Structure formats: structure tokens, C-alpha cells
Amino acid sequence: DGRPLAAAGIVVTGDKAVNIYTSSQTGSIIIKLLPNMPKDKEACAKAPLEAYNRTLTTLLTPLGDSIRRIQESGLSQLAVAVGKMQQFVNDQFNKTAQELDCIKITQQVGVELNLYLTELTTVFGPQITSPALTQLTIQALYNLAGGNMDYLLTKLGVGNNQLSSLISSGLITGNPILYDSQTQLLGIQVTLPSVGNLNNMRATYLETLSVSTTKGFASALVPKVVTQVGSVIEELDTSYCIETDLDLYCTRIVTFPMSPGIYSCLSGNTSACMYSKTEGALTTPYMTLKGSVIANCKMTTCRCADPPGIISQNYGEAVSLIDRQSCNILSLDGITLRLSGEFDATYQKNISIQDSQ
Amino acid sequence: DGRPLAAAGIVVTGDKAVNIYTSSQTGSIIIKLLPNMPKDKEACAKAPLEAYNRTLTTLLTPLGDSIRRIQESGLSQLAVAVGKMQQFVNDQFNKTAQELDCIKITQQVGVELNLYLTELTTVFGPQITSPALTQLTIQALYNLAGGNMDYLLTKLGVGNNQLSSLISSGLITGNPILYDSQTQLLGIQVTLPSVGNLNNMRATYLETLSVSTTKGFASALVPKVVTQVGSVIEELDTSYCIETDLDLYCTRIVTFPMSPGIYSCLSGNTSACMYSKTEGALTTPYMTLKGSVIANCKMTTCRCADPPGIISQNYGEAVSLIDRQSCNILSLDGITLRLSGEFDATYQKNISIQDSQ
Amino acid sequence: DGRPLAAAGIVVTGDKAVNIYTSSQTGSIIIKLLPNMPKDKEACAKAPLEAYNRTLTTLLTPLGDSIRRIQESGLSQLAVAVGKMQQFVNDQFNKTAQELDCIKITQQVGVELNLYLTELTTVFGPQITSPALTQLTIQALYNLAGGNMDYLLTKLGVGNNQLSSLISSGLITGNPILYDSQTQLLGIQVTLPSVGNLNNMRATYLETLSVSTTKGFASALVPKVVTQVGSVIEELDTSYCIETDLDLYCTRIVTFPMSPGIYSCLSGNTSACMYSKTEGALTTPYMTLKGSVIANCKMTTCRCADPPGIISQNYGEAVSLIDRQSCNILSLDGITLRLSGEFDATYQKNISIQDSQ
Numbered sequence A, B, C: 001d002g003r004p005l006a007a008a009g010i011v012v013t014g015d016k017a018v019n020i021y022t023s024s025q026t027g028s029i030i031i032k033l034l035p036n037m038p039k040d041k042e043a044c045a046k047a048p049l050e051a052y053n054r055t056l057t058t059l060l061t062p063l064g065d066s067i068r069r070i071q072e073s074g075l076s077q078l079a080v081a082v083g084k085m086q087q088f089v090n091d092q093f094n095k096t097a098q099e100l101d102c103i104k105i106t107q108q109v110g111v112e113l114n115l116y117l118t119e120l121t122t123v124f125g126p127q128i129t130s131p132a133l134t135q136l137t138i139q140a141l142y143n144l145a146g147g148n149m150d151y152l153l154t155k156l157g158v159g160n161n162q163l164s165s166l167i168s169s170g171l172i173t174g175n176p177i178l179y180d181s182q183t184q185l186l187g188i189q190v191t192l193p194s195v196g197n198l199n200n201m202r203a204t205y206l207e208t209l210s211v212s213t214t215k216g217f218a219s220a221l222v223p224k225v226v227t228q229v230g231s232v233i234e235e236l237d238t239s240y241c242i243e244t245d246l247d248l249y250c251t252r253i254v255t256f257p258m259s260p261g262i263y264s265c266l267s268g269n270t271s272a273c274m275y276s277k278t279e280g281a282l283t284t285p286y287m288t289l290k291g292s293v294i295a296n297c298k299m300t301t302c303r304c305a306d307p308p309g310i311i312s313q314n315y316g317e318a319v320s321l322i323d324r325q326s327c328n329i330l331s332l333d334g335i336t337l338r339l340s341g342e343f344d345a346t347y348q349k350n351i352s353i354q355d356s357q
Ligand SMILES: *[C@@H]1O[C@H](CO)[C@@H](O[C@@H]2O[C@H](CO)[C@@H](O[C@@H]3O[C@H](CO)[C@@H](O)[C@H](O)[C@@H]3O)[C@H](O)[C@H]2NC(C)=O)[C@H](O)[C@H]1NC(C)=O
Pocket: A348, A349, A350, A351, A352, B058, B061, C146, C147
């Protein structure tokens, strides 16, 4: 649509793609809670494994239960000394020899065992923590697509330029359907969608400030969201769509035709537009948008606190932009928005080993 | 309601129960961050404990802070050698004897400790992580109910058939209200609802495809949601209800009467139904629904690329109901949708010990 | 607004402040996954470090991947025995000596290393888990504001009495934008608002019960949400606002004027109020509210099961409140709610060390 209509008081808040989808595809992820241990060097490993396999059931038990409830619905003489004493220390040192191995080995098994639990909870946290559907971690999906993400999406329908969008959409969800307390096995059931992107159709979001022109009583009449494919341009009933920043995942596409004037305006012309005054006294002659503020500097007073100055707008402008680069600290008769700022920080740890005696 | 009206163009997207609820019940979970240690074996335990108790405060300090901020508002001669040498290795080995014990005991205490923290954060993750109200993990609800779930639900009003529903609802939440940094004590305050299920009442969500019948311009006129108790059938104002898959958790029940024609239609008859044509050119003739895709295959070609052949229909039917069995790949003109798919995967870890000497 | 209109059937569900906001401020967190280790005492720490630095990549690799995808778019003789024997046990014990140290040190480096991963995932869980925008944990904000929470809120705009609110708002979000697998460095980009609290303006939520007065058909006509600055009282279009419990974070303040009758009513007068009867047969004559229930105890028989009694209002009252203090178990012809009740429990762990020999 462009923004010549900006001068008409019509501000474009957003433009987005449109797609039809279905939660038809499906999949299952079967988690193996007890890691695959090496053959027999367990006598040592038995210690930590127990602690682990314990919290494990201390954790999952409830999740399991719920799953159920839901589903239901003398040189010669003394020389003897050297004989014994010598053989003895050998035996002792040997005990100590391997006695240092078990420790050395359990030491490692525990740590590895511990890493796995936090890894596990990090990845399937949602599922581990609730019986209902839940968003899937980026890790989970990936594993599910056996590291071959290119493959999965292609099956799903979207391209890379729709991954985050898809993710945030909250369409790819999963849930715990099985928990073998004895084998320590967890069965999650993912649910993917089959997005089918329409084409060359884009929904466009519209917002309107109280412009004067006709009079400071003016406020153009247009819909909130309109879609269009070619010359057609009808009002889109978004009620049937999940709406991400970039895409619009709709189950259906119900729409409505609009006055000929409306079309005429929204499409290049400005005059066609029909203002009016439903607005109340208290309505604010400015609005926020993408970390910026679009305001009818004529209707009020655009005072810029940082670069001192009044941000005025001559005729033809209809509405000013005011953003990070134009001004740095706006003030619109009552409030004071700060249009710029930063913060940096680092998160890190310093380990401190305590020597011993 | 049934589906004779499917012939009329009235597709029924869903049926759900209805219950009034009140966030009146309440509870408090008081966590003890430092595990109950055994009395005396400490000297060894102090090392790991310190580290843990350290990160504990590193994690909870901020959370603690916010809570405040929020609330404000020679046979004889050489024989001697054997005497000393002997007694000596005895003492030394004995040192090494118990010196191998501490290492063994802390080795254990560390792992147990470490596990408890990831357990702790998995269970009370939301709470530990934000001062506001947050969904309760299944594990926490359970603990709170002292393992006796049957008891709790009984008090909340619901039965097992509503457990998943409730959890999904988001009505059961908790928030931190206490954090003794010295004692290492965390105080969560749970808030449970008091759902009182209405009886024999059921809301039914309706949707409508552009049927022809009257002319390919047709499209029945009916509410989007209607509740009913026996012969009574009015429009439901869902604005006052958390909407779960199987249940509707409302705070009130606001409804409106409908045209006698409407009641006639929705209730068996089909003739009473009054169509119209408010739809626009771009409105798609096929909606989507739980994996399948209902569509007016009369209104557009429904080619199925998998088992080939046009899914057709004719007279009396109204709309096709392309299912997964029926077809594996729809093609409603311009947009091909997968209606079936699958994926499986396994999550498991292979520990890999290292040896010593 | 008060409650003299409570006699008119107008119940006030809530009162909230109003503020303008703009996601203009921005910040960046840069995590260091591998802790700062001590100089050359690694030989020992190398073992656990390996495991840790492994699971790290195991975890972050997908996240790192998605980020890319998105961004692309004989006294003399035997005396000799004592000579060697003695010297030997010395050397041997000494090995055992320091062989007991590495085990002591890695014992620690492990636990520390293990905690930092769960801490890390606890803190930047959302960010680690998804490439899209996600709520920031309290611990992250804190860190970002260098422990100096007061300064931050000052820059953002709200006061301490708006922290809880702000967090809940969900306006403060962050998202990964960089994962240096080699250095093991994560790069989160936070986004904070710049709420500019409007002043003395307040949005008042209104709801109405079917009062009789006129007749058990009455049902006053008033908006759902009205704002008011001084004597002005127009209807608010909350459409443009995030709605917290305490605050209303809007992007704009659209409003509409209301009949002079309306104004007259809402502002003290009761008569001016224009009732009607759009209500259906099935509409309930009582609502729920913050753990209590406002009801027309004249329309239905209000009976308190617990403290027995027939809660009943009287001419001019028009409605009743029924608190926890008032009653414990309310009964509204059909349903019974638990206006009160509690639960308490504790969560804690008991470590059980295993002895050795
Ligand atoms: C490694 O070096 C960093 C330097 O950035 C150290 O960071 C500092 O450590 C303190 C203590 O953990 C951090 O937390 C503090 O917590 C108290 C709560 O009692 C709070 O009042 C302080 O405001 C602060 O948040 C602190 O953020 C941080 N300070 C600075 C100037 O960096 C880190 O501790 C070192 N690693 C280790 C293990 O010591």
C-alpha cells in the first residue's frame, strides 16, 4: 500500500504474509532416562547411579500418575620381618591401588550422570513438568528431525524464513503419554502442523491518528486489517489466525468487501477517504510503534527534551515520525517517552579450587 | 446438536462442558533449599555444601530482592629399623585409610547435593524465576496435595476427567513471597480455584462454509458459540471464560436469545436456516479442523495427489470432509496440505568412562 | 467511581492505572558458558571439564543452528632390604599422596562445574531453549541492570510499585543472536520498554448483574471499561493495551464519548441509568470475582452451607458480596462454591550417605 496515505492519517502498523495450516502431522519422542552405561565397571558406578535413579523417580512419579488419571478418562628370625612386612605393604598398596580407581571412576560417572539430568530437564522441561500440551524446545524438535532440519521443515511446509515465526506461533506442541517407572522410560507425543503458504497475498495492518486537515476532528475510516492479492483488497477477519510477527497462521480466510470509497483511498487515492469524529476528548493524538512514536505534532506539543526543540510539522506532513535519530527524549503533554537507551552486561563464573593437606 | 445441519453448511467445530469457578482456595508451599544433612559426617561434606549453598544465594538473591520491592508496595641396631619402619607404614596407611573415606563420602554428598538443585529448579522453576503469578508444575501441585491427589481435586470440585483441563486452564498458580537467605528457605504461595461444574449444560462452537444451496452465494447465519440446557438454546458470551480444550472455565454465564428461525435451524430443522452473502471474493471455501480439512469440494477442485482422484460430492452432502484415511495429500486449488505424517526419535545418552593407574 | 451505583446493578470489577510505552530501549547480555578456571591446576580438572564442555555443545548446537537459519533471511645383605623397602614405601606413599589430591580437586571442579550448568539453564532457560523472543527471567534483568535495580526502573519509567506489573506485562523480552561454539559464548539481546505513566488517568472496569428494580428483566447499560481524567469520563478501547493486574500498558489511548445519560449514571446518579433486557434465559444472576462472588441474592436463593443462613440483600442493596468472612461455602441454586479453604506442605530432601571401608 505504501505511505502516501500517511498524509491522510492512515499509518501502516504492519504487513504480514498469510498461510493455511493443519495440525495433522505427528510424531513421538521416546526418552531413555537412565543413560547407557559401560559393561561391568559398575560396582563403583552403583553409588551415584542409585542417587540419580532415585531423584529420577522422585521427579517423574507425579507426572506419571497424572498421565494415568487423564488417560483413564636374630638375622634368620628378623629376616622373616622383611619377608612379611614387604609382602604386606605390597598387598596394602595394591588395595589402595585399586581403591583409588573406584573413586576415580565413580567421580566421573556421577558428574556425567548429573550433567544428563539437567540436560534432560532443560530439553524436555515443559513435558516433564505438565500433562497437557506444551511448546517444544528448539532442542526437542531438532532431535526429532534427527539433526536434519532441512528435511523436517520441508515436510512441515515452511522454509527457513519461517522457522522462528513457526516456533513462536506455538503450533508445534507435545505432551507426556507414557512413563515406565521401572525401565525409566518417557514417552512424549509431538504434534506438528502442515502449513500451506498462500501466495502473493499479504495482510496489512492499519491504524489512524486524529488528523486535522478537514479539522482536528478528523479521523479517517478504514478497517483494522486488510488483505489483498493483486487489485482485490478486502477486510480480513483475523479471528481465525495465530499471528506471529512475520507470518499469519490461519485455519481459514473469512473476509469482507468494503465501501468503494475505502478501496479507492487505501489504494493510492487520498480524497476517497472519509474522516469523522467518534474519538473522545481523552484520546491521545499520537501512538507508539516499533520503539517509536507517531504523533500529530500539530494537535499537541512535540517537545524534544534531549535535542532541545519543538518538533513541529508543516502542512502536508499530517503526522510526524519522531524516532531515535530525529529526537532522543520525547514529551507529549503529560508523559515522557525515552526513545533510546542501552545496557550491557556479562554473566560468568570463576571457580575456586581449595587445595588440601 | 448432531450433524444434519452439516448439510445446511453449519459445521460444528467443537463441544465443551461449562463450570463456574472462583480463585478462592489458597495454599503455601515452604521449600527447604539446604538438604537435611546427617549429623557429624560434615568435615568431608563442608566442601561441596559450600559451593552449592553459594550458587543457591547467587540464584535466589535477585528473586529475593524483588519480592521485597513488590511487597513494600647391627642385628640389635638394625632391628630398630623394623620397629620404626613397621609402626610407620601402619600409621601412614591408616592416614591413607580414612583419607580415602572422606574422598568417598564427599564424592557422594556432592552428587546428591547437585541432583537436588536441578530437581528443585525443575519443580519450582517458574517461581524461582519470577515474582509474579506463574503456572504450577505438576510436581508442585502433587507435593502440595501431599501425594494424595484424589483428596485435593475433591476439594477443588473437579474429578480426574478435568485434571488435564484444569492444568491447561492456568487457573492454578503460585508466586514467591518469602526467601530467608540465611536459613535458605523459600516461600511459595499457591492459589487454587473452586470450580463448580454446571450440569447438563454444554457450549457448542459453530462455524460455516459458503454453501451453495440457495446459490453458491449462500452462507448460513448462526452464532459462533451456543450453550444449551435441554430445549433451551441461546448464544453464549464466551468473553467471560478461560477456554480449555475439554472444558470452559467461566466466571459468569452471559447469554442472549436468538431468532426463532435460528433456534429452529440449529435444533434439527434445516429450512428455518437463513443464509446470505457477506463473504468476499478472497474468502476460502475450505476451513481446517483438528488435522482434517472440511471443504465445499463443489466450490473448488479437491484433487488428492496421494491416492489420486478428485474427492467429489454431490447434492444433499453440502461439504466434503477430507480426512487422513480418505486422502493423504489434499490440493484445494493453490495450496497443497499434508493430512498425514509421522516422525519418531529417541533421546538417550551413552556415558563413556576413562581408566587410570 | 465508588459504589452507590452498586444499588443500580453496576458492579466495579476493577480499577487500574494507565501508561504509554514504547519498546525503544535495548540491551545485550553476553554469557560465558565455560567458567573462568584457575591457572595450571587443570591436569585434574580436565576430566570433568571435558564432560561439561561436551554436554554444552550437545545442548547449544541446535539453538546455534536455528539462529543462523533465521539470520540468513646376612646383616649387611638384608640391611639392604630395609634400604630399598624403606625408600620404596616413601616414593609409593608419595604417589598415593598427590594421587589423593587430583581426586580431591576434580571432586570439587566437578560439582562447581555441575552447578553452573543448572544455574545457567535456570537463568537463561527461555533464551537457551528458543530463537524467538522470550520472557526474561528475573535473574537476567537483575544481572543486566548490574544488581542496580533502582537505576534500571528509573531509566525504564516505572517505580517499584510497577515491577511486578512490568514483569507480568511480558514487555521485557530477550532472544539469542549468537553462539560461538568454539569459545562457548552465548549472545542474548534484551529489549526493555520505556513506559511513560500517564497521570491521574484511571481505567475502571465495569460489569452488571440482572437487577430487578424495574423488574427481574433489568440490566443497566454501561461500557465495560471507562477511563476518566477529572470530570471527563469516556469509554476506553483497551484493544491497544497489555493488561496487567495493577497496570494497563497501552500503545495508544483510543476512546469514545457516551450518552449524557450514561455519564450522569456512572458519575454518582442512579436514575439516569438505562436498563433493558437483552439477557437470555440461561444467564446466571451472579458472578465470580477475586475469590468471592457478587450475586443478586433476590433473584436466586443465596444459602451459606457452612455458617448456615440465607444471605439476603435489601431494597437499595441490589446485589451482595459474600466474602470468606461472610461465608465459607456459598450455594447459588445449582452450584456450591468453596469461598474458602487452604493447603500447606513442605518440599525438602534428606541426604543419606553410604559408608565405605
Ligand atoms: C568472577 O568475577 C566476577 C566479576 O564480574 C564476579 O562477579 C561479582 O560476584 C558477585 C558475587 O557473586 C556478584 O553477585 C553479587 O551478589 C550480591 C548478593 O548478596 C549482590 O548484593 C551484589 O550486588 C552482586 O549481585 C556480582 O554481580 C559480581 N560483581 C561484579 C562487580 O562483578 C564473580 O563473583 C567471580 N566469580 C566468583 C566465583 O567469585
